[PDB]
Design a protein around this ligand. Structure first.
Ligand SMILES: Nc1ncnc2c1ncn2[C@@H]1O[C@H](COP(=O)(O)OP(=O)(O)NP(=O)(O)O)[C@@H](O)[C@H]1O
Ligand SMILES: [Cl-]
Ligand SMILES: [Mg+2]
Length: 317
């Protein structure tokens, strides 16, 4: 344990918070009061030692790109219903037993998508996948425009709004990467400071090639997520201890998208927007800016094809 239960901690902006039970490095948290922190807590506090690299990285992301007003101004300007980027609420330093810790306050979210996926026998419907992906595309556009790539989009990093199950949020920026510091795009090479390569089954060909992640890589990761969610599988899932096999398959399947559709979907029965999205992402150069509205239009055609529309309904349960 890093905190005493009911402990009051004060962040760098002098806002006071109260610590509750773990949700062991994440606790329920709320604004300081006489009341005890309950299971209905609107916040969480993440705490790690001061020397922990991922919390520092994550905190720098939240401080630079997730301030409540910069998020609200984006939502207003882009006329969005919401933006699945968790808001930054504060951070500080905390001492315990002569050891220095860093903490960060963020909103409390509900279930991860991986649990809902596993309870639905490892399937999400076409409507769900298109609705999730439209929101993920808004999220990616936002973080990319704020000089960052996520590099690790997957169902376990996607959380529902604790009070609204039609609102999904992308979490975990511990290994996010600033691909465009001060508007200067990174070169096609490895970052010496950066070690990680994402989640093997979903990671980009760029990551497999040992180069730093860029915008096309996050869009390619979303592509593998869509197939996985729609079919319950990926062609290379039985060879995940062999990264050169996983890369070889991804390369061969990018080169011939129709054979990927033939492999993943029942014979001659593949949703067309998936192949079109993948062909679009395939045309991006390492440093090129994606045309997000074009990608979102590809998915909207998919919603039209099933006789639906972008009504923001995730259709989970
Ligand atoms: N703001 C949040 N609200 C609610 N739950 C959260 C929040 N942030 C993280 N969690 C969940 O808490 C768990 C641990 O979080 P975290 O350590 O940051 O993720 P991780 O490193 O990617 N995975 P793992 O260490 O294996 O649990 C996960 O199941 C998260 O979905
Ligand atoms: Cl199955
Ligand atoms: Mg997390």
């Amino acid at each position: 344990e890093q905190f005493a239960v009911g402990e009051i901690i004060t962040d760098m902006a002098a806002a006071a918070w109260k610590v509750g039970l773990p949700i062991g490095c994440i606790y329920l948290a709320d604004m300081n009061s006489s009341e005890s922190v309950g299971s209905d807590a609107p916040c969480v506090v993440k705490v790690e030692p001061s020397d922990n690299g991922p919390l520092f990285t994550e905190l720098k992301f939240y401080q630079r790109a997730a301030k409540p007003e910069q998020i609200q101004k984006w939502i207003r300007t882009r006329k969005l219903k919401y933006l699945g980027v968790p808001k930054y609420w504060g951070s500080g330093l905390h001492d315990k037993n002569g050891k220095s810790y860093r903490f960060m306050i963020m909103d409390r979210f509900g279930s991860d998508l991986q649990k809902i996926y596993e309870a639905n026998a490892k399937r999400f419907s076409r409507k769900t996948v298109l609705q999730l992906s439209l929101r993920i595309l808004d999220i990616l556009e936002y973080i990319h425009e704020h000089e960052y790539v996520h590099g690790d989009i997957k169902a376990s990093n996607l959380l529902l709004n604790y009070k609204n199950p039609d609102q999904v949020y992308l979490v975990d920026y511990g290994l996010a990467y600033r691909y465009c510091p001060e508007g200067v795009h990174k070169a096609y090479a490895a970052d010496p400071k950066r070690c990680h390569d994402g989640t093997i089954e979903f990671t980009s060909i760029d990551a497999h090639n040992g180069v730093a992640p860029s915008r096309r890589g996050d869009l390619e990761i979303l592509g593998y997520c869509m197939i996985q969610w729609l079919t319950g599988h990926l062609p290379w899932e039985d060879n995940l201890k062999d990264p050169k096999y996983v890369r070889d398959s991804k390369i061969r399947y990018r080169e011939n998208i129709a054979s990927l559709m033939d492999k993943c979907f029942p014979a001659a029965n593949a949703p067309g927007e998936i192949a079109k999205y993948m062909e679009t992402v395939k045309l991006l150069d390492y440093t090129e800016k994606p045309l997000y509205e074009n990608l979102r239009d590809i998915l909207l055609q998919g919603l039209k094809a099933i006789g639906s529309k972008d009504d923001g309904k995730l259709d989970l349960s």
